[PDB]
Curated annotation (Swiss-Prot), chain A:
Component of the RNA polymerase II (Pol II) complex consisting of 12 subunits. DNA-dependent RNA polymerase catalyzes the transcription of DNA into RNA using the four ribonucleoside triphosphates as substrates. Component of RNA polymerase II which synthesizes mRNA precursors and many functional non-coding RNAs. Pol II is the central component of the basal RNA polymerase II transcription machinery. It is composed of mobile elements that move relative to each other. RPB9 is part of the upper jaw surrounding the central large cleft and thought to grab the incoming DNA template. One of its GO terms (biological process) is maintenance of transcriptional fidelity during transcription elongation by RNA polymerase II. One of its GO terms (cellular component) is nucleolus. A zinc finger (TFIIS-type) spans 71-113. InterPro entries: DNA-dir_RNA_pol-M_15_CS, Rpa12/Rpb9/Rpc10/TFS, Zn_ribbon_RPB9, Zn_ribbon_RPB9_C, Znf_TFIIS. It is found in: Nucleus, Nucleolus. A zinc finger (C4-type) spans 6-31. Keywords: Acetylation, DNA-directed RNA polymerase, Metal-binding, Nucleus, Transcription, Zinc, Zinc-finger. This is DNA-directed RNA polymerase II subunit RPB9.
UniProtKB/Swiss-Prot annotation, chain C:
This is General transcription factor IIF subunit 1. Heterodimer of an alpha and a beta subunit. Interacts with GTF2F2, CTDP1, TAF6/TAFII80 and URI1. Interacts with GTF2B (via C-terminus and preferentially via acetylated form); this interaction prevents binding of GTF2B to GTF2F2. Phosphorylated on Ser and other residues by TAF1 and casein kinase II-like kinases. The modification Phosphothreonine is found at residue 114. The gene is GTF2F1. TFIIF is a general transcription initiation factor that binds to RNA polymerase II and helps to recruit it to the initiation complex in collaboration with TFIIB. It promotes transcription elongation. Induction: Up-regulated in response to enterovirus 71 (EV71) infection. The chain holds residues 5 to 180 of 517 of the full protein. It is found in: Nucleus. Coiled coil: none annotated. Belongs to the TFIIF alpha subunit family.
Swiss-Prot record, chain F:
One of its GO terms (cellular component) is nucleoplasm. This is General transcription factor IIF subunit 2. InterPro entries: TFIIF_beta, TFIIF_beta_HTH, TFIIF_beta_N, TFIIF_interaction, WH-like_DNA-bd_sf, WH_DNA-bd_sf. Heterodimer of an alpha and a beta subunit. Interacts with HTATSF1 and GPBP1. Interacts with URI1. Interacts with GTF2B (via N-terminus); this interaction is inhibited in presence of GTF2F1. The modification Phosphoserine is found at residue 126. GO terms for biological process: positive regulation of transcription by RNA polymerase II; transcription by RNA polymerase II; transcription elongation by RNA polymerase II; transcription initiation at RNA polymerase II promoter.
Length: 114, 85, 138, 144, 97, 222
RNA sequence: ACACCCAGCC
């Protein structure tokens, strides 16, 4: 996890290890730049449902005329008594017909599931 | 290019009413019923304005203009803005 | 203090004819260049054409410093305009129209893979190993 | 268009005049903090390692054109012409419409990655908003 | 019979046989646009609070909304709803749109 | 000191300039002033926690434009200069970006309509004729180009047959000038009848077959 | 002829 580039030729960094010190080095495979890593991560894969749609919905979705509105689920932060609820329709799950709610107040848009 | 250099430019398109040329060569307005009966084609002449210029090493440019040069006939949809109806 | 409620109003001036041309310049945010090191520069037209309709090619500090290449802006200033307010001792702004927008990009100086030897090594479509050894032979 | 076999996308991007991968991924990827798309585009960069500069990328494009030929400059010119006048003509035909084409190709790859991740639905050939109707006007214009 | 044929194509009028579904008929109020030049739209958008592609860092695209005209990415805009309301007002008032 | 050197005094002074985007009408008005010296004024006010910027148009020029500031850290905007002496200098760096918008909302759309009307003046669309055109293909005794060509042909006349020695002298000048030749160009240079040229060339010259373009004559006697 | 439409009945 975490992608960043070298400052010399601005190409993709790659992991590498040295035998003298035994420390991870994110070195540029193109140029001759090296740097010390700070996470000890290379390849994180997520097989089950870790999409975290709560942080993926754009808060401006509330002002879409085609979405339903409800008053039984008030906003937690600003306390507005109107919200817009919708489902996900994303692949890799094809299930979990759950509702994601977005507050319709301007200068707001806290997303919450329930 | 052959020394002279000839340049032709097509600028303006004109398009008259549908017309028919009989054996005499006399143009007359083609009425759509007449086209249906006599198996004609309901088409209007298409005229274009052309500018011809010649470039010579002696700087003797001409700007001659062939106005409304006939370049064929376009079939005309009935009851459109360019029909007789 | 005076800076909290500073009041400033200077007169704008637009000359008609100016013997020297202007152009907008903008590096990329990630270039991270320095201007003190730019002791010498050479801004000449590229030789790849073989004049006014060709790109430039910046060469900084000869072969020691970095080189840059760029292109004119695709858009045209038919509706938009760019003016620069140059500071002067008398304080009157002098708005100056520009002629072109330029964007040079960084280029790295190192032994580069050639097209012919690239074709030669293309046989190793995915069988290639030891990426350092690719450049070591050359 | 006018190339008889597939080309990796990073080669096309490099041919458009963007060498450093930072510039490539600043067009394909708009949000830095999104590891999934970065991981999904890793293979595209890994395949394009051997191609390192604009002119060699142009050679890559041109070597697989209509004619192999003999010399280099001719198919460098051929690749430049096919990327300037035949690849996405609707965004740019002029000589220096390269940044716009780069952004559009980046948007295309971004849409592909979004579809792969499942963040968008694949489009339908029938959503009748994706179909245009050539009437007498456009058809007669096509002949004329 | 796709869902998007509502009001544009008759759901009933098709031939039966080898051409079923492929040959359709316009709805009774369907109108097909003859097209228009996208120039005035582009001039208005540039005059409005829109920033062109070449004048922006790539980092700003993520938060802003993209503007496509006739399928061509023209630039980006930071306030989408204001632009949408203004454009709809112009179209409804038979202005340049 | 060199022709291609870029002067960087402006950068060392950290001079900050303003980049302002203005519509077409303001720029056209400023251009119409013919560089009189002044075209307007700019008013910048600073409150306890906000900054207001505006441009006041000169009353003489006409016979209030609020300004909006954008982010600066997205790109590094600078400006350079090129002069007639091929001397490159850097004026400075842009420190703030400005956007100019018209205060008017509804009435300014009328000016937009006028601008669109002006922009649609030179675009051309086909016209319609009430009567069929009959001025073309007008009868004529002969075409102008044809009579011109006959006049030229009768002023110049036919190329006159000459004695063998003088045509041979042109041939000698010819293969002194260039080793190889094409039959047409030789005819043009010598200005001699084609059958007579062939007769006087076959005696001394021979035809060499080539696999590149066509067989051709050789002016060398051997 | 040939070709292309349209149409009928399953
Ligand atoms: Zn590197
Ligand atoms: Zn809320």
């Amino acid at each position: 996890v975490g992608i960043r580039f070298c400052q010399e030729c601005n190409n993709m960094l790659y992991p590498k290890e040295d035998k003298e010190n035994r420390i991870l080095l994110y070195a540029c495979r193109n140029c001759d730049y090296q740097q010390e890593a700070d996470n000890s991560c290379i390849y994180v894969n997520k097989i089950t449902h870790e999409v975290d749609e709560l942080t993926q919905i754009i808060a401006d979705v509330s002002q879409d005329p085609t979405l339903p509105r409800t008053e039984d689920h008030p906003c937690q932060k600003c306390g507005h008594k109107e919200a817009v609820f919708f489902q996900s329709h994303s692949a890799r799950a094809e299930d979990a017909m759950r509702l994601y709610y977005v507050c319709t107040a301007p200068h707001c848009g806290h997303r919450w599931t329930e | 290019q052959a020394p002279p250099r000839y340049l032709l430019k097509f600028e303006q398109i004109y398009l008259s009413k549908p017309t028919h040329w009989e054996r005499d060569g006399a143009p007359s307005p083609m009425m759509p019923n007449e086209a249906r009966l006599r198996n004609l084609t309901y088409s209007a002449p298409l005229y274009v304005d052309i500018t011809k210029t010649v470039i010579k090493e002696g700087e003797e440019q001409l700007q001659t203009q062939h106005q409304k040069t006939f370049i064929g006939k376009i079939p005309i949809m009935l009851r459109s803005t360019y029909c007789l109806l | 203090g005076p800076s909290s409620q500073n009041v400033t109003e200077y007169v704008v001036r637009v000359p008609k004819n100016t013997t020297k041309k202007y152009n907008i310049m903008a590096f990329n945010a990630a270039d991270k260049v320095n201007f003190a090191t730019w002791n010498q520069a050479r801004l000449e037209r590229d030789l790849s054409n073989k004049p006014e309709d060709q790109p430039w090619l910046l060469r900084v500090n000869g072969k020691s410093g970095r080189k840059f290449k760029g292109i004119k802006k695709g858009g045209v200033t038919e509706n938009t305009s760019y003016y620069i307010f140059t500071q002067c001792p008398d304080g009157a702004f002098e708005a100056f129209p520009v002629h072109n927008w330029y964007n040079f990009t960084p280029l790295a100086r190192h032994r580069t893979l050639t097209a012919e030897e690239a074709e030669e090594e293309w046989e190793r479509r995915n069988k290639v190993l030891n990426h350092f050894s690719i450049m070591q032979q050359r | 268009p006018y190339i008889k076999q597939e080309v990796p996308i990073i080669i096309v991007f490099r041919a458009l005049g963007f060498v450093s991968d930072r510039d490539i991924l600043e067009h394909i990827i708009y949000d830095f903090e999104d590891p999934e798309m970065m991981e999904m585009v890793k293979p595209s960069l890994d395949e394009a390692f051997v191609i390192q500069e604009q002119n060699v990328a142009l050679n890559f494009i041109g070597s697989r054109g209509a004619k192999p030929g003999v010399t280099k400059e001719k198919r460098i010119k051929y690749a430049k012409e096919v990327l300037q006048k035949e690849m996405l003509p609707h965004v740019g035909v002029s000589d220096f419409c390269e940044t716009k084409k780069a952004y559009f190709l980046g948007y295309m790859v971004h849409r592909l990655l979004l579809a792969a991740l499942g963040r968008r639905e694949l489009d339908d050939r029938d959503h009748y908003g994706n179909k245009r109707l050539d009437l007498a006007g456009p058809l007669l214009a096509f002949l004329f | 019979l796709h869902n998007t044929l509502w009001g544009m194509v008759c759901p009933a009028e098709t031939p039966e046989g080898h051409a079923v579904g492929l040959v359709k008929n316009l709805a009774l109020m369907a109108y097909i646009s003859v097209g228009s030049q996208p120039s005035p739209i582009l001039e208005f958008l540039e005059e409005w609070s829109m920033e062109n592609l070449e004048e922006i860092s790539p980092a700003a695209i993520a938060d802003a909304t993209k503007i496509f005209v006739n399928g061509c990415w023209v630039g980006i805009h930071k306030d989408p709803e204001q632009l949408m309301n203004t454009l709809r007002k112009l179209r409804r008032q038979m202005d340049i749109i | 000191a060199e022709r291609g050197e870029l002067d960087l005094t402006g950068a060392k002074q950290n001079t900050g300039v303003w980049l302002v985007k203005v519509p077409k009408y303001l720029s056209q008005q400023w251009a119409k002033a013919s560089g009189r010296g002044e075209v307007g004024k700019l008013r910048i006010a600073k409150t306890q926690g906000r900054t207001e910027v505006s441009f006041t148009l000169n009353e003489d020029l006409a016979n209030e434009h609020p300004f909006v500031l954008q982010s600066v850290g997205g790109q590094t905007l600078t400006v350079f200069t090129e002069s007639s002496s091929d001397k490159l200098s850097l004026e400075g760096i842009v420190v703030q970006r400005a956007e100019c918008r018209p205060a008017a909302s509804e009435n300014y759309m009328r000016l937009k309509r006028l601008q669109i009307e002006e922009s649609s003046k030179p675009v051309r669309l086909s016209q319609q004729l009430d009567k069929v055109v009959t001025t073309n293909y007008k009868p004529v005794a002969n075409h102008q180009y044809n009579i011109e060509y006959e006049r030229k042909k009768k002023e110049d006349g036919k190329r006159a047959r000459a004695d063998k020695q003088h045509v041979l002298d042109m041939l000698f000048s010819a293969f002194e000038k260039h080793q190889y030749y094409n039959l047409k160009d030789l005819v043009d240079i010598t200005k001699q009848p084609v059958v007579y040229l062939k007769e006087i060339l076959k005696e001394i010259g021979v035809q060499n077959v080539k696999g590149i373009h066509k067989n051709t004559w050789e002016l060398k006697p051997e």
